[model samples]
Target chain A: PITLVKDILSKPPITAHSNISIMEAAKILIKHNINHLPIVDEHGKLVGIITSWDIAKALAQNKKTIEEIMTRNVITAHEDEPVDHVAIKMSKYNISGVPVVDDYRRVVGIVTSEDISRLFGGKK
Target chain B: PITLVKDILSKPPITAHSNISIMEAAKILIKHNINHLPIVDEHGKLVGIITSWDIAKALAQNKKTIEEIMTRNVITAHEDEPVDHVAIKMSKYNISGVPVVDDYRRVVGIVTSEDISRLFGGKK
Candidate 1:
């Protein structure tokens, strides 16, 4: 069987809620050494996604909360979706990472372009 | 006659001297909104590479200089090298970004795995 998102995804995705202060979110980013985080609400439904890029801008502009810079309706893939479909979404939109969500839109895992790039490089 | 490193590289690479304080490099990172930077010496040749990851640590540990945390002898690609060959280097070394240098070993540009993944994704 072909690989699915669940097969290659990073589990227990580190995420933040909208209420996180901008500097607090920056601390998480520094501690984790990660570029992006899927923002979820209190009930764990996906609120959006945040990026190191977003954090930089927030600090630069003195924006106070994650809500100020989160990308709403960020593209996400289902856990059971084929990897090829996920790559296409990245290619079509030039996305660097995608959060993997459950049937209920709870963040479950993450896939970065590096993973896809490694898979592609193996063939050629 | 296919794409070469020169064809797809970002030009006028942003870089910093090793003597720059860690906070100074961190400032540059935010000003440019870039994740990685080519570190250079007084001679304007490649000293190594620095990353956002290192900046995070420097800030945490109170490390003072870029030289303290810089990655020396990092993998680099030539401007004339084929993209195929460069991609292979990236795959082989698990490198996320490679600095492109001139024949004089002066940094000219950089390429990330995203560039390779984009090419691969566009193919299918």
Candidate 2:
């Protein structure tokens, strides 16, 4: 069985445009203790998602711009998409998280390994 | 019955990266709630990692530049490496996530606290 959660995204989830400065994103990443971000447009539509890995890659190469470094061509999932489907995508792409998008392609919420971890039962 | 992934990483993980700014990273964190950065080389190979705790510690001390404040040397795990080996490495390094690299030293995926959260048998 699978489920979609509406509590996490709520349309206007915090996001950045493709052109936003990399330094700006870095600051946000450091302060929040988060590992990923959904990149959105002015209308708050999902466009790309950034991860600590993205940032780390930026640092390793001394990359200067978000566009130059941030990952584009994101792979997203629908909220109603099955957990099994999500797992398939994750393993196929080697991704840790996926953005939950709506029919209009707007970000509704996000799903990460943490969310799926609950499905497996937990913490011995 | 065993695993890898390691102990909680010594530091916290933050979200995104580029070159200098931590501001954008903060906004995403405040917005999404996450921490940790996996630094990668020019060829997309992971070379270092940073976390929210690292940023918080820096901010607490008023620091700047990821290059100025990143964990330079990291002991990583390969995908073929056993889970038991990862657990031992975790105990030795005190890391929550172990960046998985290929023999060519390119980062293919990541293993994190969230990834290891499902070790016990419950919830299901």
Candidate 3:
């Protein structure tokens, strides 16, 4: 039997409101040692995605909020989707992580390259 | 047969001199869409490491140069080291990438989680 994204996804994914300061987002990333943050609306619906790379770019400018630097057209995955499928999406887009959304297109969890690497058992 | 860091490391790694501005380092990362930067001295000796996360954190303060935000004790790998050893170091340190150094401890290249994932034929 194949594994599913839900099996490996980090539940209740750490997220930030789009209105939050970029600095706050950075704090969350550092606090948790995570590389990505899925921006959510007031209702917890997926809105955008921000990565450490995005934040790094933002450092060059005086961007106040995440909206200014976030990638708005977020590519997400279904929680029930196969883990391999999610990995494929990550590879095709060259993204390090993806938000796992529920049926209503609301953010539920997240998956990252680190998570996938563990599944394969690193340092073979 | 074992693959080595030299085989997979990004050669002529995009790097910055230790005295460069954080904004300048951010620019190099953004222009390349990479997540890490190796700080080298005038003699090309590895001095430190910086990540997108480090840049993000710096945004919260008024820090000016890369030196202020870079992690001084960088965990690096040698060009001839086994790729698995590099992966193990990354996992142990919870870092996504590492600089590849020569026997003389000069920055020669860099290896990232992305490179490792591709080596495994992602999504399989």
C-alpha RMSD values across all candidates = 3.5, 10.2, 2.2
Q: Rank the candidates by lDDT, best first.
A: 3, 1, 2
Q: Is candidate 2 or 3 superior in lDDT?
A: 3
Candidate 1 wrongly placed segments (more than 4 Å): A1-4, A19-33, A58-64, A80-85, A91-94, B1-4, B19-33, B58-65, B80-95
Per-residue C-alpha lDDT of model 3 across residues B1-124, encoded as one tens digit per residue:
7888888888888888988888888888888888888888888898888888888778656567787788898898888888777777777887888888877878888988777755644526
Tens-digit per-residue lDDT, B1-124, candidate 1 = 4667787787779988887766566667678767778988788899888876566455345566777888897899888887778777876875678998877888889987667667656665
Identify the CAPRI category of the predicted complex in candidate 3.
medium
Off by over 4 Å in 3: A61-64
- Regions of candidate 2 where Cα sits further than 4 Å from its true position: A5-12, B1-124
How large is the interface RMSD of each prediction? 3.7, 8.7, 2.1
- For model 1, residues A1-103, the per-residue Cα lDDT tens digits are 5778887787779998888766666667677766778999999989898776565455345566678778897899998888778888887776678998887
Our model 3 lands, by Cα RMSD against the true structure, at 2.2
Best by lDDT: 3
Q: After the best TM-score superposition of candidate 1, give how far the Cα of residue B104 lies from its true spot, in angstroms.
A: 3.5
The digit string of per-residue lDDT tens for model 2 on A27-95 reads: 665655455678888888876787765664554445677777656788888766666566566656757
